[PDB]
Amino acid sequence: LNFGQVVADVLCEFLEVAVHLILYVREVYPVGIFQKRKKYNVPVQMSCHPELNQYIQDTLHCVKPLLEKNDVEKVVVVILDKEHRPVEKFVFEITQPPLLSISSDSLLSHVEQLLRAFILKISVCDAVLDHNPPGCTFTVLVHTREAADPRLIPLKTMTSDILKMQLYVEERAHKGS
Amino acid sequence: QVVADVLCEFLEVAVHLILYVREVYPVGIFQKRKKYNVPVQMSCHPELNQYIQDTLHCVKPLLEKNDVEKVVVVILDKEHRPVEKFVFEITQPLLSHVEQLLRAFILKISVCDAVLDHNPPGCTFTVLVHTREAATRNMEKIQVIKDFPWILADEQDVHMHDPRLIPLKTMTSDILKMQLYVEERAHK
Amino acid sequence: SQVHIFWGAPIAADPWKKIQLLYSQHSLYLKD
Amino acid sequence: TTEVILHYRPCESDPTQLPKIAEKAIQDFPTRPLSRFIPWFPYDGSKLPLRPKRSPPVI
């Protein structure tokens, strides 16, 4: 494959973990379906309901080409309540630099630590989150990018810069009954 | 002792679950169990299991009387130094209600392994009970069962270097207020 | 700039059917 | 005005009604201020926690 696809591919792996984690934490779905699996040598809670896993996989299967083309502004994970009102949203914003100077080897190595740093943002963000109304569910939004002297070949950089997406959680003032 | 009865059952689960997650003890001893409607690994070892039940039993009288300010499960290495602290700040101001509120805490205990740095081999644990009043009342009150005595902890026992904060969860119920956070030593 | 809403989550060939609509003033309506 | 592309499954009984319902998910909603974590009782240094004399078996 090429760099673009290996970056895009990794992104989603993080996202697959994040959605499962956000479901576990928020108690959207009963916890029994969850078994602990190791992704990139990180203990990630993952699900064992094939109906729920398939929904997530297909979703990401449709996001991955949109990332391979830098057409993703952000991907949201709206938790909705009984009347399909958003209760809270976990916004993951993707900052994709045009240059994309960094090579993969730097990216491949910082993958586990990056996944660990991701879990922190999600895990430390919901500590202060109140409890969601009972009997909930979720959706996933994706917003395509709005707008766009080397010919090519920008100098090599080995930084971990802009290879992570930062999520800002939004909590409804009145979640509900 | 309306509330305090619930907290000990809850604290016992966390102490057991905490060990499993940080790998304080080898996994052979722990047995999957459904506590608080979550799958958690409790221990099936006698020498340790009584130590646990005996510690918390000594805390209830302070919880019945709300002499308790926080309860800290500390993980200690071979050199008996502090590495990670599981602080449980507790403020006390329908029966199956709270039993659902606390469930959040188990979930966040069980996902801390990804975010905490791996601890050193052969670790041992302990509990710190911070009383609300520094008074003697609690130090004589806390030693209900004999043959299991409490003391004061010195700086050597409690002081940790390069501590980092990993918040886990905060709840603000009408009947129980509680906070859970972990202080981690930067270099282990 | 478009937003793709994915639907169908577990209750409280081709994988996805699609409906194309437009967003105007806090309401959703179908294409021309 | 921005283009939406609702994706739904063949299982759904009502494809036609998805737009008025999903109209709810896209809507922004009044956000609660960002609460930040702060320990109620900070590390004290003058108050000593009570530690049991006994120690774990550590088998």
* CB contact at 8 A, A123 and B105: no
Residue A53 lies in a domain: yes
Rounded to whole angstroms, the Cα distance separating A176 from A88 reads 11
Q: Do B48 and D59 lie within an 8 Å CB cutoff?
A: yes
* CB contact at 8 A, B147 and B124: no
- Identify the domain containing residue A41 by its residue range: 3-171
3-state SS assignment for residue C18 = strand
CA A149 to chain CA centroid, nearest Å = 33
Q: Name, in order, each residue with C-beta under 8 angstroms of B136's C-beta and a sequence gap of 6 or more.
A: none
CB atoms near residue B57 (< 10 Å): 14
Rounded to whole angstroms, the Cα distance separating B6 from A81 reads 30
| D23 contacts in chain C (CB < 8 Å) | 26-28
CATH number, residue B15: 3.30.900.10
Asked if the C-beta of A49 comes within 8 angstroms of chain C's C-beta atoms, the answer is yes
Experimental technique behind these coordinates: X-ray
In terms of DSSP H, where are the helices of chain B? 4-22, 46-57, 60-64, 95-101, 103-110, 112-115, 136-141, 155-158
* CB contact at 8 A, B126 and D52: yes
Closest-CA residue to B107 (of A147, D45, A126, A76): A126
Full DSSP string of A87-103: EEEEEEE----SS----
Q: Are strands D3-8 and C2-6 parallel, antiparallel or unpaired?
A: parallel
| D37 contacts in chain B (CB < 8 Å) | 165, 167, 170, 181
Residue A113 lies in a domain: yes
Asked if the C-beta of A145 comes within 8 angstroms of chain C's C-beta atoms, the answer is yes
Rounded to whole angstroms, the Cα distance separating B14 from B19 reads 8
Residue A148 lies in a domain: yes
* CB contact at 8 A, A160 and B155: no
* CB contact at 8 A, C12 and A58: no
Residue of A nearest to B106 (CA): A25
Instruction: Suggest the residue from D9, D11, D24 to mutate for an interface test with chain A (most A CBs closer than 10 A).
Output: D24
| B115 contacts in chain A (CB < 8 Å) | 116, 119-120, 123-124
Enumerate chain B positions whose Cβ falls within 8 A of a Cβ in A.
37-39, 101, 103-104, 107-108, 110-115, 166-171, 181
Q: Do B124 and D55 lie within an 8 Å CB cutoff?
A: yes
Asked if the C-beta of C7 comes within 8 angstroms of chain D's C-beta atoms, the answer is yes
| B58 contacts in chain D (CB < 8 Å) | 52
3-state SS assignment for residue A6 = helix
Q: How many domains in chain B?
A: 1
Q: Does an interface of 3+ CB pairs under 8 Å exist between C and D?
A: yes
Of A32, A115, A123, the CB nearest to B111: A123
The resolution, in angstroms to one decimal, equals 3.4
Residue B93 host element (H or E): none
Q: Do A29 and C5 lie within an 8 Å CB cutoff?
A: no
Terminal-to-terminal C-alpha distance of chain A: 49
Residue of B nearest to A131 (CA): B101
